């Protein structure tokens, strides 16, 4: 019998959660065991984690995490069984990886901001030192502005961490400016939470008078009040290819395009006029 | 080497994710290794899970769910590896398990709304099916009312599937009763969180206009407006004394008692008065 392994960063945060869950659900399709395992996101826990798969013995790797190293690109290369990241970025291509756009997504993101008229959108990102963000997402942000004759303000890029909190942190400051960014476009439900209430907890009211655009589209952004617009991120897809990709993988098969991309899209809510 | 086995109903469950979540914090202390499993909260997917852990050798199993039937005890009764349950009851008291008084939270937390002036609190529990509510919970609640003297209004308990949807169900649905409730009390954070919203999605005003206390005291509780205020469940504590347990019975060693309870608390927000 076959029993692939999953490992994500945090067990809790809502997106890893779902898309974990979307595995169980695929897997039950296939008749495959699931595996799970956390890392807190710490590289050393992630190799280990590599080890500790193999030593439990799970014929695949679905492998989940906002960074990949140049070791794990390295390590994972000489990896026992098979493996495909998902919904994860790995700046040398070399690795399976089955995800979205992320660069255009955070273009549709901020072109409608502008299709409304917004003319400075400010930028709350996770840490820029992931790759997801610096080179993916940022651009996106930079695309739009740039392309749409508009200046790129450096203050209107703004670090976060992922955190509910960091989120209230950063539309504290970016209410600092002496421009007022009437539309934040935030890299994440979570972190959006974070905004959406930080601009309310001061008086701002959204989208009457500053818009919010999220991403994931996780359970999260209908649990918010206004219910929050998230880029949509094809999460059953995602974890659907993503599975039959490693199948052939393991069934030493080949694969014509590793690198797979899905479509994604902007679930429009109350958050935004 | 020792790897323990905690097998989760909903991965995605903010609830019991935050909680193995935490087991893993446990799980570096004590220099164990942790693989996680999904049932999907459902019957049939645990009984085999639990013979997936059993082939695995995992040194121990940390069982959570929302019911324990006869048919459950029944294979945990006689399972390899030992097991322990969690924020998880069963009714026989066969299989071990570290918990909190459910029907005294319940209790406890709408005495508090009692002690308001509240004559009309209504309550929305999770599945009835579940004997952490039929037999608890509810339980609980109703007791605090009779207690009083005040009466239980059969209208007044409306039965949810712990989504936030049928928390906003819920709401509107108690609030087309003739008598309108003043203060309700939700059996969960997410359901609670839902509660509120359509509550002010109709509106009315937390507190001032409705007064609501969850149960969990999860993330949620301070990612909404207002905070929620919620029935707080020793995370880590229970975490932790199962851990101790389960080493007990893995170090084949005589256990001073099988069922351990540890004491709640509610942590009061701006959600309440």
Redesign the interface.
Known sequence: TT?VGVIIP?????FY??L??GI?DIA?MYKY??????S?QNQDKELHLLN?MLG?QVDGIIFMSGNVTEEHVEELKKSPVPVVLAASIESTNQIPSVTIDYEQAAFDAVQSLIDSGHKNIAFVSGTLEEPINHAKKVKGYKRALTESGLPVRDSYIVEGDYT?DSGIEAVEKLLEEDEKPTAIFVGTDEMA?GVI?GA??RGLNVPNDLEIIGFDNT??S??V?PQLTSVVQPMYDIGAVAMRLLTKYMNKETVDSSIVQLPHRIEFRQSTK
């Open positions: 029993t945090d067990i809790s945060n809502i959660a779902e974990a869950r169980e039950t065991n699931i595996i799970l395992s956390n807190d500790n439990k509910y939470l209430h309310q907890d359970r999260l209908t649990m009040r």
